[PDB]
Amino acid sequence: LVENVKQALFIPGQSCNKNLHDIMVDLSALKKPDMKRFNRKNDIHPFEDMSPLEFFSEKNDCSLMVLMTSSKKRKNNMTFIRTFGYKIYDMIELMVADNFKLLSDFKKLTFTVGLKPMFTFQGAAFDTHPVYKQIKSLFLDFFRGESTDLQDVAGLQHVISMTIQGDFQDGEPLPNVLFRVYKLKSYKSRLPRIELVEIGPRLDFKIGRIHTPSPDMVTEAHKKP
Amino acid sequence: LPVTVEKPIPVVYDLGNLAAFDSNVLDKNDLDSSNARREEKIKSLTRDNVQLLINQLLSLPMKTT
């Protein structure tokens, strides 16, 4: 009954550069094998016109999309886009801070491609705050991959960790979200003692503009059998 | 070597998605980009939640065929 794994399409925008492209490549690797990359630059402006994104979604059969854009107002801008029936469901701009680390900045370990990642979300706002609830929903939907009734313990390889940069009060600017990826190591104490090793990429996301779905679309996209 | 983790607010789980959710208090100063021991705190906190997650997973219907 469940759908196929959602496919991700990474799209370089007109203002995409090499540094932002490196970020695309390393983050796209986490989505293997359910991922496609475009090589050319496309003149897309989501919050002005959504038509091209809906076009690419249909013709490439990708319900997840990431546009790469950079200006001085919005530097290293990654616009995450989800579609339902090839129409835009929601959008959020996540801008990468300058303190980012690529896969080259971490010691390369052995890594089986295509395993179900684990998730940990740190921050109470992930459950109560409208903005952070969307982000939690987004990254769960984006990286979880294959749904299954059966799990091999040996397949529990890496974790995707997302942490809100400190608690905050209503009215203040929204704190960044800290994207981290760790490989698991387990030792004997039955339960094992768990330790983590960072493998990257390391990203600090600054929250930008947001597009939310209408009640009608939510009804259809979340309809129960 | 301890495999248990104590926290003020209990961690919630969505094991169908291999996910854990922690609503405990976060300190801004511990996570600021200028704080040098930043990533030590991120990983340490993550390690605790992964530990709790793995504990919950290993308590599911299980068999070593």
Partner: peptide, 22 residues
């Protein structure tokens, strides 16, 4: 095959579908 398997419970997080329910 020798391996440790788990049976995962139903997901609880309400994620949107990509396509209409048939």
């Amino acid at each position: 095959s020798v391996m440790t398997l788990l049976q995962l419970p139903d997901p609880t997080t309400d994620l949107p579908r990509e396509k209409p329910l048939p």
